[PDB]
Design an enzyme around this catalytic site. Structure first.
Site, mmCIF file in Angstrom:
data_model
loop_
_atom_site.group_PDB
_atom_site.id
_atom_site.type_symbol
_atom_site.label_atom_id
_atom_site.label_comp_id
_atom_site.label_asym_id
_atom_site.label_seq_id
_atom_site.Cartn_x
_atom_site.Cartn_y
_atom_site.Cartn_z
ATOM 1 N N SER A 133 8.840 14.835 16.620
ATOM 2 C CA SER A 133 9.301 16.033 15.946
ATOM 3 C C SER A 133 10.468 15.669 15.039
ATOM 4 O O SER A 133 10.283 14.833 14.150
ATOM 5 C CB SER A 133 9.625 17.125 16.924
ATOM 6 O OG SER A 133 9.474 18.393 16.283
ATOM 7 N N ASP A 179 -0.419 22.062 16.640
ATOM 8 C CA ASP A 179 1.028 22.097 16.687
ATOM 9 C C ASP A 179 1.538 23.392 16.066
ATOM 10 O O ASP A 179 1.165 23.712 14.950
ATOM 11 C CB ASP A 179 1.601 20.904 15.914
ATOM 12 C CG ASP A 179 3.035 20.567 16.264
ATOM 13 O OD1 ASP A 179 3.836 21.520 16.480
ATOM 14 O OD2 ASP A 179 3.343 19.354 16.299
ATOM 15 N N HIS A 210 2.222 20.592 20.390
ATOM 16 C CA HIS A 210 3.341 19.859 19.828
ATOM 17 C C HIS A 210 3.711 18.620 20.640
ATOM 18 O O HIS A 210 4.292 17.671 20.057
ATOM 19 C CB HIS A 210 4.548 20.779 19.684
ATOM 20 C CG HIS A 210 5.707 20.153 18.993
ATOM 21 N ND1 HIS A 210 5.586 19.491 17.774
ATOM 22 C CD2 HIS A 210 7.002 20.141 19.318
ATOM 23 C CE1 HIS A 210 6.781 19.068 17.401
ATOM 24 N NE2 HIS A 210 7.663 19.444 18.324
#
Length: 263
Positions: A133, A179, A210
């Site tokens: 991320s 995601d 995610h």
């Protein structure tokens, strides 16, 4: 010539899908982290020569636990890996990039410190960047800022900077189809589609949330094969890993595969 960076025997599908490569690994906690909050260093005890170093950064609000499966996985194939905690869990991608580079700097100094378990174990000219991320966006940013980095393999990357047209660093983007935090077509797709001058690959896990590439995920056989193969091919210039790095895995667990300029 022989490639002086080759370590370990010829890879196989099963040797790469295995939990562990051919090398024993140990780990230590960094005593006095410099420019980041905390760090765990994973290293091979017995790689048969210096190996490159990879720094891995978590996502927003997360810690080493989210991304540290990569530590043993990569170390056991002949890499020194540092998984870090950021100064603040709320740090944004540019800050994460700085901390990622700081972590690599300290891995390097420790490899030149006689006290250290990794004394003389690191080729400090051969570095890689990974992360989840915002730590994944930080990895892209690290690669953009510092073209001498040998490889990047971020996962479910988040970045407000969208333009990575300047990248010459070989980059594997791991993406998660479903995601909802770093939506693929706002983040991973955009990042990948900006690239044109670098070996690159896009590996998107079918119905991934995610966290599809985080510790405990159900696709370590595939993701570990691809991450190790990418780091071997590009960090070690190890042509024995071209097919593994560059090939379509042709897996139903992959909803989208893309590759370009990979031999």
């Amino acid at each position: 010539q022989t490639n002086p960076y080759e370590r370990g025997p010829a890879p196989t599908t099963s040797s790469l899908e295995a939990s562990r490569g051919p090398f024993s690994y140990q780990s230590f906690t960094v005593s006095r982290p410099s420019g980041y909050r905390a760090g765990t260093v994973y290293y091979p005890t017995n790689a048969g020569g210096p190996v490159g170093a990879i720094a891995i950064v978590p996502g927003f609000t997360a810690r080493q636990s989210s991304i540290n499966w990569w530590g043993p996985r990569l170390a056991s194939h002949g890499f020194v890996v540092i998984t870090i905690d950021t100064n603040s869990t709320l740090d944004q991608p540019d800050s994460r990039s700085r901390q990622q580079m700081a972590a690599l700097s300290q891995v390097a100094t420790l490899s030149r410190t006689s006290s250290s378990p990794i004394y003389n174990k690191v080729d400090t000219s051969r570095l890689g960047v990974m992360g989840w991320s915002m730590g994944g966006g930080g990895s892209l940013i690290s690669a953009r800022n510092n073209p001498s980095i040998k490889a990047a393999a971020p996962q479910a990357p988040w970045s407000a900077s969208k333009n990575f047209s300047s990248l010459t660093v070989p980059t594997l983007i791991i993406a998660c189809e479903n995601d909802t935090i770093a939506p693929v077509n706002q983040h991973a797709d955009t990042f990948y589609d900006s690239m044109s001058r670098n070996p690159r690959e896009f590996l998107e896990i079918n119905n991934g949330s995610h966290s599809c590439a985080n510790s405990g995920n159900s696709n370590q056989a595939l993701l570990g094969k691809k991450g190790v193969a990418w780091m071997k091919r590009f960090m070690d210039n190890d042509r024995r890993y071209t097919s593994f790095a560059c090939s379509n895995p042709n897996s139903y667990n992959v909803s989208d595969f893309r590759v370009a300029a990979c031999n």
